[PDB]
Amino acid sequence: AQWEFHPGHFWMRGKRPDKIVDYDEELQLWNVYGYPESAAILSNPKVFSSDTMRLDPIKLDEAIVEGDFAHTDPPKHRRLRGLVDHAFTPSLVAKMESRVHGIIHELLDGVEGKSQFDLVAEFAAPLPLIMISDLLGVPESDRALFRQWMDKMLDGSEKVLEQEEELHKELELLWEMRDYWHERAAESRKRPREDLISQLVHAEVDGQKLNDSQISNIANRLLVNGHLTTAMLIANTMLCLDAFSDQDARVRADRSLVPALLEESMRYMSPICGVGRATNSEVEVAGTVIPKDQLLLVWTGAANRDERQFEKPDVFDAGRSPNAHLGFGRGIHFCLGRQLARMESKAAVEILLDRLPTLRADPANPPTFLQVVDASGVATLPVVTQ
């Protein structure tokens, strides 16, 4: 029934926010919790900028953030995202679709003799890492390297002298990743393959193109945005199914519900539950006037429990309609990979139900939750096969 969430994620413990907007004196930032406010904010990029680092001293060199459109505003955002969407071709997308079943089955074969395991480590996490890697065109040998990379990034996210300390740590890993992708981009310029790096290298739009530094930073962004949130979606869903057994029977009796189940999992336990914005001018949100050049955190996780928007918000309802949650954001930064996340997670859940029909969450070994402030979800999920 009840679990051990990040201490900041009060909405997961059923608490309504005391105020729609408030200010954190210690961290010197603003929080927004309401759904219609969060939605208006995300829809208003010209006052609520995604260029958060302009507030944060010290700044990464331009070559390091070059092309990362998740932190860019229009008009440059429109151009960068345009080139990357062009490179996400219908061919590449269908290729991932045609592969997803075989990869799921291969993973599940690797635990066919185990009675107890961690669903995250054995399945929910490797599946989207393998899919995003395959998309980008990475050899099989290198996906261990990606695992190590993400592990490093999570350890830091969980954890002027110390201002420079953290700087070195972050840069040394981005250097390594950038150098990896530059080599891929260079190879694919000479001999293009059937993958996203090759499409990013040849993408041309009116009639702009990307250089290898931009391409490398884009690949890094897709990598970090891709797999861990998808892993949490899959694992959070199986956890919810385990805890709400009526919904479990409901879904097993009606496999048509799985797409709506995943959307309800998105809403109820949001893998990304907060996104950062910076204000360009003075604004009034709800009642509160927020000053210029302020960091604002938009808590999509909390907004997804807002009763002004959702009837019975703290009920998990596997067939919930309507369900316009903010799990993938809203507006111009609307999650670029959401169809891929939905495709992967649907296939994972469908096959889990069929192949491990007596699967249950390990009662002797409770789930651990990711202790990262802006992600709500399972870090480990011990399960038993019988």
Ligand code: HEM
């Ligand atoms: C359950 C899975 C996922 C969740 C919950 C998720 C969530 C989000 C959210 C909330 C945003 C918007 C952030 C903001 O407004 O500041 C976003 C953006 C993005 N996501 Fe996802 N995402 C998921 C999967 C993926 C996947 C699989 C990919 C790539 C293959 C991906 C790539 C991106 C990219 C590139 C953006 C940036 C779009 C932009 O700024 O224009 N995401 N995602």
